[PDB]
């Protein structure tokens, strides 16, 4: 006597190229009802660091995540075709971090001291 269970495959499929983003974190919302994106964190990153893959780990935090100005440009350079350029500014997660570390009367300043001129290149955040 064999039964049929309620966990059907059509209730578990997923797929998302782009769409809605959260108001604050600017990430895919959640699950399947909100057309969210799968989450990578902790152990997953530890695997990617183990394999020694830096571009793959980088583009799972900047491009397909928080970047306001970079999601649009990858969409543009992916509709049409070009060589995907590496980003420069930090994702909006770091911007939010510096924002609520400013609310506690604390600083967090990035710097890019050059190896050829010793000129400070403090980023704006």
């Amino acid at each position: 006597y064999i039964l049929k269970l309620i966990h059907q495959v059509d209730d578990k499929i997923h797929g998302r190229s782009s769409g809605h983003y959260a108001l604050v974190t600017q990430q895919p919302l959640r699950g399947r009802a909100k057309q969210g994106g799968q989450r990578v964190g902790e152990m997953e990153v530890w695997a990617l660091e183990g394999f020694g893959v830096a571009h793959i780990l980088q583009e799972m935090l900047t491009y397909k995540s928080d970047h306001i100005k970079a999601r649009q440009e990858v969409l543009g350079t992916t509709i049409i075709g070009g060589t995907i350029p590496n980003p420069e500014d930090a994702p909006e997660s770091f911007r939010l971090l510096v924002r609520e570390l400013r609310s506690l009367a604390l600083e967090l300043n990035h710097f890019l001291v050059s190896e050829r001129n010793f000129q400070i290149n403090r980023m704006e955040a």
């Binding site: 660091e49 394999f51 020694g52 893959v53 830096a54 571009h55 780990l57 980088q58 935090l61 900047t62 928080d66 980003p87 930090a90 994702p91 997660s93 770091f94 990035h110």
Partner: peptide
């Protein structure tokens, strides 16, 4: 910080 890790 979202920057590139210095490994691999």
């Amino acid at each position: 910080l979202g920057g590139m890790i210095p490994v691999g």
